[PDB]
Amino acid sequence: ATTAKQAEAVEDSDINPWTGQRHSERYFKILKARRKLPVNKQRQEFLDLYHNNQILVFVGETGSGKTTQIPQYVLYDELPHQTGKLIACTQPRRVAAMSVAQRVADELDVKLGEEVGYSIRFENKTSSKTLLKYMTDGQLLREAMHDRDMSRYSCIILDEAHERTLATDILMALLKQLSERRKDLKIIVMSATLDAQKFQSYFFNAPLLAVPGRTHPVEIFYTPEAERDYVEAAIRTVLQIHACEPEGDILLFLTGEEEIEDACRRISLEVDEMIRESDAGPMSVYPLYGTLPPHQQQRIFEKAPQPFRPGGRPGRKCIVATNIAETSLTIDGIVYVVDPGFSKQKIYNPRTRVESLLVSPISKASAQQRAGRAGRTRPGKCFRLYTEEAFKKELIEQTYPEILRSNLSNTVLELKKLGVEDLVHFDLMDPPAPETMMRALEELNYLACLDDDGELTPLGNLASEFPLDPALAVMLISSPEFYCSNEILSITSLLSVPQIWVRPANARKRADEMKAQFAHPDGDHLTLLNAYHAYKGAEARGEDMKKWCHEHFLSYRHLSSADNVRAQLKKIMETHGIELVSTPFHDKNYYTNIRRALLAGFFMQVAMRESSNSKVYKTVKDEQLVLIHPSTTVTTPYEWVVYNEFVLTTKQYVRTVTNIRPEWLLEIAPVYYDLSTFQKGEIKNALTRVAEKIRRQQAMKAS
Numbered sequence: 274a275t276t277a278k279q280a281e282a283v284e285d286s287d288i289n290p291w292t293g294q295r296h297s298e299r300y301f302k303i304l305k306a307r308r309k310l311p312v313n314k315q316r317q318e319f320l321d322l323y324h325n326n327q328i329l330v331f332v333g334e335t336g337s338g339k340t341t342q343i344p345q346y347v348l349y350d351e352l353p354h355q356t357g358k359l360i361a362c363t364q365p366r367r368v369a370a371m372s373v374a375q376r377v378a379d380e381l382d383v384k385l386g387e388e389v390g391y392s393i394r395f396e397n398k399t400s401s402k403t404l405l406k407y408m409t410d411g412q413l414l415r416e417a418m419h420d421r422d423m424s425r426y427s428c429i430i431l432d433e434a435h436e437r438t439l440a441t442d443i444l445m446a447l448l449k450q451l452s453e454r455r456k457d458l459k460i461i462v463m464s465a466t467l468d469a470q471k472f473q474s475y476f477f478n479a480p481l482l483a484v485p486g487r488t489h490p491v492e493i494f495y496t497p498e499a500e501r502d503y504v505e506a507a508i509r510t511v512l513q514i515h516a517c518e519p520e521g522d523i524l525l526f527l528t529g530e531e532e533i534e535d536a537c538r539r540i541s542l543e544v545d546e547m548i549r550e551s552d553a554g555p556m557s558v559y560p561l562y563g564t565l566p567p568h569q570q571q572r573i574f575e576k577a578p579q580p581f582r583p584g585g586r587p588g589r590k591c592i593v594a595t596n597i598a599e600t601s602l603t604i605d606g607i608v609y610v611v612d613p614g615f616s617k618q619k620i621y622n623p624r625t626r627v628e629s630l631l632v633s634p635i636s637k638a639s640a641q642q643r644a645g646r647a648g649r650t651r652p653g654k655c656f657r658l659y660t661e662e663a664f665k666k667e668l669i670e671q672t673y674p675e676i677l678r679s680n681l682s683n684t685v686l687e688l689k690k691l692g693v694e695d696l697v698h699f700d701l702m703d704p705p706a707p708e709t710m711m712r713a714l715e716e717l718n719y720l721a722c723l724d725d726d727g728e729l730t731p732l733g734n735l736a737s738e739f740p741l742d743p744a745l746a747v748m749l750i751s752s753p754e755f756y757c758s759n760e761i762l763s764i765t766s767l768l769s770v771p772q773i774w775v776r777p778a779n780a781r782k783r784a785d786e787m788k789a790q791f792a793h794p795d796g797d798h799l800t801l802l803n804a805y806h807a808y809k810g811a812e813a814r815g816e817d818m819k820k821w822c823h824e825h826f827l828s829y830r831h832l833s834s835a836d837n838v839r840a841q842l843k844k845i846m847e848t849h850g851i852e853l854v855s856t857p858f859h860d861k862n863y864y865t866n867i868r869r870a871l872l873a874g875f876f877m878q879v880a881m882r883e884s885s886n887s888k889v890y891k892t893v894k895d896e897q898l899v900l901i902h903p904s905t906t907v908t909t910p911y912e913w914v915v916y917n918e919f920v921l922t923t924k925q926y927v928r929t930v931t932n933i934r935p936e937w938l939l940e941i942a943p944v945y946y947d948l949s950t951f952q953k954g955e956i957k958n959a960l961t962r963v964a965e966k967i968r969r970q971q972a973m974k975a976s
């Protein structure tokens with residue numbers, strides 16, 4: 274009922290309608306600038322759509338005014354309805370939510386934390402006055418876990434929806450479901466780099482509002498030939514920009530903390546050289562990555578240094594960041610973007626059930642976002658450190674959905690916590706294949722994380738609290754019953770990261786020698802345990818651990834990761850009251866306890882020797898024929914083994930293997946190894962003979 278014209282008349286008022294205070298002069302300067310933005314040209318057109326459709330897809334160039342202006346339009350449109358509900362707008366990163374919340378607070382001439390606020394994990398900058406809240410996807414999902422209808426919100430705006438992250442996809446599915454339940458909820462989906470028709474079609478053929486035009490141009494430059502060392506090329510480019518180009522700050526995208534710190538060091542040294550030798554201007558260098566404290570991350574916004582003298586070469590700021598700065602941000606002063614074209618992206622190893630990070634080429638959408646960090650408040654330039662043909666033909670359009678690159682059992686437990694009942698038909702934008710989902714559900718049911726009705730069990734609920742493959746979580750939770758929760762804590766942590774063994778082709782012998790120091794003849798899990806213990810022991814002596822790992826042919830990266838994970842898991846166990854126990858090393862049962870404890874998590878990954886006449890084993894699951902992997906430390910594999918990994922190469926192997934006793938299977942997983950209903954075959958026969966041996970032995974003793 275209220276038009277863009279009426280709203281504009283209210284915005285022009287001397288009085289702030291939200292607070293009753295006089296509007297400041299800064300407010301009016303900002304308003305004057307705001308009304309020149311592309312999106313403004315279609316405000317009414319937006320309102321119309323917003324009025325006549327529950328869900329709409331909104332696309333417009335980077336910097337066109339989506340994130341700052343659309344929620345304010347909605348704000349002016351919504352609150353006469355007296356609903357007492359909020360408008361939510363989700364950003365990919367916390368620094369983005371905070372930054373844009375401060376900006377919009379400025380635009381509305383209110384205090385941040387009051388009428389405009391933000392919500393991120395560990396910090397809720399909102400109050401009773403809050404009408405518009407910027408938050409992360411994850412935060413909104415965490416709220417959705419306690420409020421399935423999301424009753425606090427009248428409108429939810431999924432920003433940067435092109436980022437197919439786990440949180441984004443799950444949110445989109447939940448919201449698509451909820452839109453059928455709540456007709457008083459509005460949903461806006463927006464991005465500059467979106468597959469519009471895909472998203473429209475997904476949201477019940479929602480309408481599209483497409484806004485043309487850029488505030489400022491961004492000139493794109495490509496390299497004439499490919500260059501392998503992207504770090505050196507990036508540093509060289511930054512230095513050349515500082516030496517030759519006019520005033521303007523630089524945003525360089527790199528892939529990780531260590532790389533970024535090293536690059537910052539090198540850049541700073543070279544800059545010092547240029548200064549003392551060639552009258553170059555000063556340049557401040559800011560690292561930016563996720564493990565930095567958020568308020569320390571906000572340091573990237575401070576002003577570049579002044580020139581050394583009047584008429585001197587410009588002072589400059591250089592931000593060296595991960596894709597934490599790829600979207601959403603307006604860093605005023607930025608003129609140059611340097612895009613090497615790489616980022617750390619999640620991969621999932623289905624044989625080891627391990628999620629890790631791999632430096633990979635970015636998508637076209639990501640490149641466009643990165644470039645879009647410039648051309649917001651002034652013209653910009655983007656130096657892509659790759660050829661135009663490599664952009665046009667080698668880069669994928671959109672990054673593959675994270676849900677298809679993640680541990681699906683984990684995701685399933687999370688979805689159960691979110692109130693999702695039918696997972697087989699859960700309408701994701703890009704669902705895993707029905708068989709993959711069925712496999713996850715099957716495994717979780719056997720692990721007793723889901724009951725036979727498919728409902729979450731207390732064990733499943735507790736397991737979901739751990740950043741682990743659910744089998745590992747169940748193993749850890751169960752470990753106090755085997756009197757070895759410290760060792761299982763360690764082993765779980767190690768099994769949550771990639772292989773720690775390093776075996777270069779030119780030094781394999783030496784590698785083997787070092788590995789021999791940790792080798793346990795009864796199990797690879799125990800060898801892992803030993804390696805970790807040696808690592809911590811060397812660390813306690815105060816040794817250089819990068820050096821130590823290098824000389825022992827162990828991965829410092831993965832061991833360090835596992836150590837951090839262990840700390841986290843320990844904290845969680847202590848929070849939920851799980852006992853942290855160790856059996857004295859010289860106890861007769863010390864190793865048998867641990868070997869038994871493995872079966873609480875891996876009773877479904879067990880293999881039986883076919884004959885004494887051969888070295889072939891058959892897996893309990895799917896009856897596969899395998900060999901024990903030749904990298905094992907198990908010198909004489911038992912008739913029964915537990916294994917971590919199925920390996921398919923020239924031959925079929927099981928890798929990371931520990932000797933077990935068959936009676937342990939019947940004791941520890943009696944429901945799975947229920948012989949009255951177990952599959953007929955040689956494995957069932959062997960287990961039947963084991964059970965009968967135990968029975969005969971007990972009947973005789975009882976007599």
Ligand SMILES: Nc1ncnc2c1ncn2[C@@H]1O[C@H](COP(=O)(O)OP(=O)(O)O)[C@@H](O)[C@H]1O
Binds near residue numbers: 488601
């Ligand atoms: N913190 C800020 N400082 C200065 N100008 C800003 C700031 N945030 C936004 N702007 C101006 O408003 C424009 C729109 O920003 P935004 O709404 O974030 O665009 P989009 O979400 O479409 O990328 C920017 O291009 C810039 O001109």
Ligand code: BEF
Binds near residue numbers: 334335340465600602
């Ligand atoms: F599309 Be914008 F840069 F958030």
Ligand SMILES: [Cl-]
Binds near residue numbers: 366367368563
């Ligand atoms: Cl974040």
Ligand SMILES: [Cl-]
Binds near residue numbers: 393411
């Ligand atoms: Cl967060």
Ligand SMILES: [Cl-]
Binds near residue numbers: 557559
């Ligand atoms: Cl600094």
Ligand SMILES: [Cl-]
Binds near residue numbers: 562563564596
């Ligand atoms: Cl990061």
Ligand SMILES: [Mg+2]
Binds near residue numbers: 339340341432
């Ligand atoms: Mg935006």
